[PDB]
């Protein structure tokens, strides 16, 4: 079921994986973990998302599917062709792990801490029930860190 | 401290990251997460590890460092130049996420399940207090899955 307990995100780490065909990849993942297949959905349009990539607004949307595996939430991401961290990742790297996301209680102050540590937000936006911010950690950490805030 | 509670692996997901300089990367990670720096160490020599890569024995060893961040254990890996999944990854891909590992109660039966699902073990070996097995999931899952068994 993956739904034995309701996901408590504050205590879960999410790994986002960018793929080209979400139906195919999500079937592969359901088979490997022997889990009931999750349903996928389109992220919000820009009018709700307010997506900003490298300071620029983008109409970018992506198909998403989630798997809950204990302490881990695996997120599959199939982006459209508009500009985004996901599309940029896909084109240039092919399918693979795009990010590791952590839920934080206060987005603003957390982003402050990282600014003081010399970091920067590469993409941010809203989603139903919260907001997110991708940090420019790829060169130093070898992977992109994302901050999530759930209202 | 990262040591507020003792890590309960069965309830933790590990993400292994292959890097070229563990001291440098581990400092970067300690700084980003505002945590006290962890100590690194060399994995066991083949006489204890019994490392087998693509069916072949290998004297491969790597420097490892761990970070405990709630539900996540981040593992940094700096492999030597001997043959291994890590060195192969590094040479061909450069630094980045090498795997996602899950602790299982019974290695043998779990590996059985995966064999029946058409999978295969690409590297296995022992470490102090347990053993591991890397599964050939890269083409279907876009990342390598590792199984861990702690005695």
UniProtKB/TrEMBL annotation, chains A, B:
Family indicated by similarity: Belongs to the methylmalonyl-CoA epimerase family.
GO BP annotations listed: L-methylmalonyl-CoA metabolic process
Pfam families associated with the record: Glyoxalase_4
Domain of life: Bacteria
GO molecular function: lyase activity; metal ion binding; methylmalonyl-CoA epimerase activity
Key words of the record: Lyase, Metal-binding
Domain VOC: 11-150
Transmembrane segments: none
Species this chain originates from: Caldanaerobacter subterraneus subsp. tengcongensis (strain DSM 15242 / JCM 11007 / NBRC 100824 / MB4) (Thermoanaerobacter tengcongensis)
The gene coding this protein: GloA
PROSITE patterns in UniProt: VOC (PS51819)
Name listed for the protein in its UniProt record: Lactoylglutathione lyase and related lyases
């Amino acid at each position: 079921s993956m739904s034995k307990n309701i996901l408590d995100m504050r205590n879960t780490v999410q790994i986002g994986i960018v793929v080209r065909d979400i139906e195919e990849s999500l079937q592969n993942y359901a088979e490997f973990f022997g889990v009931e297949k999750p349903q996928w959905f389109w992220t919000d349009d820009y009018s709700k998302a307010h997506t900003k990539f490298n300071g620029r607004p983008t109409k970018a949307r992506a198909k998403l599917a989630f798997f809950e595996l204990g302490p881990l939430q695996l997120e599959l991401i199939e982006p459209d062709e508009n500009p985004s961290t996901w599309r940029e990742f896909l084109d240039k790297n092919g399918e693979g792990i795009h990010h590791i996301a952590f839920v934080v209680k206060d987005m603003d102050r957390k982003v402050e801490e990282l600014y003081r540590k010399g970091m920067k937000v590469i993409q941010k936006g809203d989603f139903e029930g919260g907001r997110y911010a991708y940090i420019d950690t790829l060169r130093a950490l070898k992977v992109m860190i994302e901050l999530l805030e759930n209202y």
